[PDB]
Amino acid sequence: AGHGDIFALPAGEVLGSYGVMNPRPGYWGAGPLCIADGVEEVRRAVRLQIRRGAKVIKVMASGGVMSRDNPNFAQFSPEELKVIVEEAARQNRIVSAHVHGKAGIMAAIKAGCKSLEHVSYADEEVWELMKEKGILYVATRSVIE
Amino acid sequence: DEAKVTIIYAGLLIPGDGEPLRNAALVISDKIIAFVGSEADIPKKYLRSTQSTHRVPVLMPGLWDCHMHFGGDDDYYNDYTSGLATHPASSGARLARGCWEALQNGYTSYRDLAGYGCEVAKAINDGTIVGPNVYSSGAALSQTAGHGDIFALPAGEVLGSYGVMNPRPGYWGAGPLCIADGVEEVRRAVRLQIRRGAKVIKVMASGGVMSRDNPNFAQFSPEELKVIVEEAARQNRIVSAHVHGKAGIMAAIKAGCKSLEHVSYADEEVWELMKEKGILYVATRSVIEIFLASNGEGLVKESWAKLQALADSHLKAYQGAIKAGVTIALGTDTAPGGPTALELQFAVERGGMTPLEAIKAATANAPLSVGPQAPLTGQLREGYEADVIALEENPLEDIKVFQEPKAVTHVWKGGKLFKGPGIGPWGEDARNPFL
Amino acid sequence: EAKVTIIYAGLLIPGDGEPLRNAALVISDKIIAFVGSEADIPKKYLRSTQSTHRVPVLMPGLWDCHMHFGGDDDYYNDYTSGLATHPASSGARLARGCWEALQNGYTSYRDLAGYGCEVAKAINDGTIVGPNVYSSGAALSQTAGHGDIFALPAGEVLGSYGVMNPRPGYWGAGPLCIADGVEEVRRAVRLQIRRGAKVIKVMASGGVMSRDDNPNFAQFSPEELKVIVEEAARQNRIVSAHVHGKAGIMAAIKAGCKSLEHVSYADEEVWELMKEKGILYVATRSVIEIFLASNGEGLVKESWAKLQALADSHLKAYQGAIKAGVTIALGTDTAPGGPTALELQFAVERGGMTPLEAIKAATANAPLSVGPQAPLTGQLREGYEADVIALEENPLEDIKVFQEPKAVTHVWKGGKLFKGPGIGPWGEDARNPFL
Amino acid sequence: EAKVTIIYAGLLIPGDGEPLRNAALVISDKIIAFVGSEADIPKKYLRSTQSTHRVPVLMPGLWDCHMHFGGDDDYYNDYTSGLATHPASSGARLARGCWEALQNGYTSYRDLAGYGCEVAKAINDGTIVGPNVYSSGAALSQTAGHGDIFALPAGEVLGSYGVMNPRPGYWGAGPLCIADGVEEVRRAVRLQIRRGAKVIKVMASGGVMSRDDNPNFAQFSPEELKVIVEEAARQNRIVSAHVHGKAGIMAAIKAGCKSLEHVSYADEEVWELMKEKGILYVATRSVIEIFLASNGEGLVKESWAKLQALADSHLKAYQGAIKAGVTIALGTDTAPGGPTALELQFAVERGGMTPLEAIKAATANAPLSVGPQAPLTGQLREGYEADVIALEENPLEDIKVFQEPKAVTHVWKGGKLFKGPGIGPWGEDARNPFL
């Protein structure tokens, strides 16, 4: 049910294709999207991208005004984000977080993400944190335009 | 094109929370209520701009039932097996009749706590059918061997259908029930309901006297309940917990649930906690009353003693909560179109509410049952949503008035007339959506 | 005590045969007890009748022999919506449609792909109202056939709709069934019957879906079609074949199909075979007319030349069949509540039927579309089923009269009034089924 | 307004027939409007033409009738790379290859195993450029057949490429399809058609892969081959059979295959049958020549004696077929962009064709390799498709001229210039399709 999910399809088709359970023939673990719920699953989720030669890890950490969906709501738990960062860090990758609302922004920061996309509700507080922590700001303004 | 303005003059206007007005008027502008006050005080701009006026004896908010189940089961299986065996197309057809019927009784909002509310609301919102505002849980979450489980079927069939492992074709993750065990699974369990558009999350947090089963025993671990609350909270939902025994009640509270159903063993301590924490109490007395009316035909002696003991507790709990001034809303655990109005009767005649408090429980308080997902509604006030009904008779003099749908003469939902003089079955300006 | 109703008609169109003037029809319970002149009504019925009516025009309830009970979300334009739309949503929407159908005087639908079986359960238990629904269950298609969803990958489609790999999730109960080989095709027919299918529908040719799609190519092997017919035959169903090109037509015939849809490349040889073998011809002209009215907005040059060539051929086929006196019924390939009446217009204005023959195609002939599953119906005759409608205006003078539902004033299905003066939305003596 | 181009040619090689000197060809839009002497050009074209060209040599676009669209990672030497290489990698690599193909004057490829169907989508939508691709989809092989990957265990291979057990992961859409039994083999052909396959390819014999492998042994039963042909035939495809030994050859013929690859043990009897039945002979000599050039580096004594014995037999077969006047086309079993031109050299220097007959095999005859899926093409004639190339040098004097792509100066596919003076890498009027 996150920003990467394909809401128009039923849930079984999507997790069948892109979940980190149920290994099978058909280039399992090697698509545009990976859906993982819970600390256990998110470890295999990062590990599967590294397996392909990923040089960065990308999380959806907020909603994205896809339906009448809320960009203000955070996505993934802090517990999952922390683990995702740590997994990437162990292989010398960073994590880049899709964030709009301040709650998602703050959680991605707190977790250890070093790059943020859109960052649409960034304010004074976010700017100072990003400078203090050396976190890249990638506005992606073309999408809004 | 200008705003669509409607003036409704009322002999008696029951706002929902607060003293009723005599010789009052309410103005609707488009979807919201633009003015409430005396007939004398209507602003002149609305007298100028109005396209339609009405005069009725009694005006009040659209009613809520805060505990419905959108199941539409075939009649065949008497237990929960029907939920699994009934094809959802059948369920959906039947639920369409029920939501129509709900609207005709002045029920403009339902909180579905287990079933297809999400899926059926799509056909309400796109205009294909008509119905109340539906705030749905999607599936009720239950542990294995919990109150949601179908004990009569073997475990593999049930978790195959309703578990959060083993994704597959067949509308996986989209049934009346979701079974999840452990912190990991319960995260996907909440997430799957949100995926469907759930506007509340419902947990089974105690047993429910289904077998010679214990309502005193809690269900789910505290660890799971905490996580379930947090998951809902992150998407700005609240969690509503089915609870009977005090252990389950206390655990649901501790976890962060903001709504409790039945609450049968609630005592002094529970009442104070619910007030302190702003937790809605939904007694669902109609369910108890059903099996009191059966009177123990074909039940063993001590299993009937057990139901009465629970019923008596449930009664004291509700009475004490009302007297203690716990915040209360009404629900019945029925199918759409069912006898939701009965709960007003029981609120008065069992609970001991005044008819006015009973109405408050079914209107002004009821949106609390979805927390932050509630619009400003359930009250006749400026700025609130135009969910308004009119009655022929004064329900403060006889609360049973609500049980004759002929007595609800006009129904507005979101400023639109769905029932009223010269208004068709599918509401005003209804067009066949298949042409 | 039999429930007797007398209907006096200025004009009585029986369905097959010369219309009567100054006529009457008697209903006794569910069957038609008498048809003849007002003068000749038997006196026993004048004595026993509890209600009488007087109307300008009376005729049989109308049939559409080619409907699809899909109720899809609007989101996906193609067949993906059939898979992605949750069936609870579909069922809700189909309830509106069946209501709407009945209001237009359509008392029978033959669903050739979808949830007719599942929705008819809610009609028959009285929860909603609608036409008599004879459903195929899923349309049978080969892999890469006209029923397949080419835009999705193959695994997703056969996972959802194949006859292998049984699993939780209403397996074997969707709008589509894909089966390859004699073995699989036995289970394919059997699974529809399991749902209560009253006809079996095959895709036996391509259907100009893409540019690499060819309506001239047959689908399924003769070996599979033969077995499909035999399986249906054993349960006293017939098979209805979607066919365009002559190769597919000839194969469906050879196999034993007794109903053909579209039949776009039917020529002399096909017409004679259909008459010789008693095979119903359902043109489904409305489908061609839809993409003629688009006129090639955003289509490549030669792909529009291809549709017109098919459309032209489909026209000549239909015209030739009518002239050759092939037995014909009407269908539209629409959702319930859709514009079924249009097909009468096209039967006259394209096909070249007389308005009277057009009515025959939508009434007396239409039960042939389900073979031995048909009761004696579609005609105003003694002993036939009381599916009867009344109109304000004479449709023999303007066949487009059927396209104003206000013009159908009374609808009886099985002797029960579902529309008529002072009669509610859910029919006479309707009760809320959830109380 | 038609887009008209005049090409003056010192030498025009039409494909089937005597070459013209001092000739011209007119293109109108996508088809060839005129072929004849420069003197005889119709005046209307001299008036209407927007561009003219003058070149030494003009002929049809070349065909390779035996390509494999694999795009494998280099890592695995055997067939394992087909399974292990991610198809996104394969597709990228195949884009270079199709570009490179077009630059050498190859305007049509018949892919007999791989992703031709999937890559042609990006050619046809204009994202990349390439030849007309007629693809088999996956090659069909029995378990333990020439398509099987013996080095992996059986479960992994049938999990990936079998026609049972549909699942997420682009099921049914790989370079290989394994099917055993009549039932499975229906779905096998159907799955390729689903992808847009324009020919069906079977493995009908062994292929000296190992020492326990025998090219003399047939593969698939006659029962399976018959059904495979019939399935293809119903969609207007033909089947092309990989065959070495006479038993496999005879079975493929008997079944109804209309194209044979390698045909290494073809003798008098086979030649006559192929002529009698109109069966294309594609020798694929380049494959034999590769392992002749290795010369038995790290091969056992008798396993090198086995390859030479096959190579010799393959040679006599091809030579005899040419002399017997069997209809022949050319293919190489290479990746797109590979050394397709080599096969012309071998047709002359091994087969003993004249350079003119060699060109006929790569042009006028080559569309026979897809039977009814062929447009009128491979020839410079009025009404045929404008797939035209120009060379700097006369290939009738040196057939190796084709192996320098600098020597192909102009390439037209469907009347559109993809290579020529002042013309960019992606062809004329190319736009970045992502803006």
XYZ file of N, CA and C in Angstrom, chain C residues 25 49 69 72 89 96 132 165 177 222 242 267 281 343 357 394 401:
51
model
N -55.677 -10.477 -21.726
C -54.821 -11.574 -21.257
C -55.129 -11.801 -19.785
N -61.027 -12.702 -10.438
C -59.924 -11.727 -10.524
C -59.878 -10.739 -9.374
N -22.133 -9.676 -17.679
C -22.364 -9.289 -16.306
C -21.028 -9.038 -15.647
N -17.534 -3.713 -14.132
C -16.144 -3.298 -14.029
C -15.980 -1.890 -13.419
N -17.437 -5.136 -5.874
C -17.749 -3.927 -6.635
C -18.611 -4.302 -7.825
N -27.745 -2.431 -9.750
C -28.367 -1.281 -10.414
C -28.806 -1.658 -11.830
N -34.977 -12.619 -15.533
C -34.489 -14.005 -15.533
C -33.089 -14.017 -16.170
N -4.305 -25.963 -11.051
C -3.822 -25.256 -9.851
C -4.896 -24.630 -8.972
N -12.503 -18.095 -18.620
C -11.915 -19.388 -18.339
C -11.054 -19.779 -19.517
N -11.202 -28.331 -33.461
C -12.409 -29.141 -33.608
C -12.527 -30.170 -32.524
N -19.037 -17.474 -30.260
C -18.522 -16.236 -30.870
C -17.741 -16.546 -32.154
N -22.474 -16.490 -45.082
C -22.881 -16.384 -46.488
C -23.997 -17.389 -46.734
N -29.098 -17.316 -34.684
C -28.224 -16.283 -35.227
C -28.447 -15.037 -34.392
N -31.010 -2.522 -30.310
C -30.852 -3.644 -31.221
C -32.111 -3.882 -32.031
N -41.287 -8.482 -36.948
C -40.235 -9.509 -36.941
C -39.159 -9.186 -35.897
N -47.475 2.475 -29.590
C -47.425 1.328 -30.468
C -46.085 1.190 -31.160
N -39.573 3.318 -29.860
C -40.407 3.570 -28.691
C -39.806 2.885 -27.481
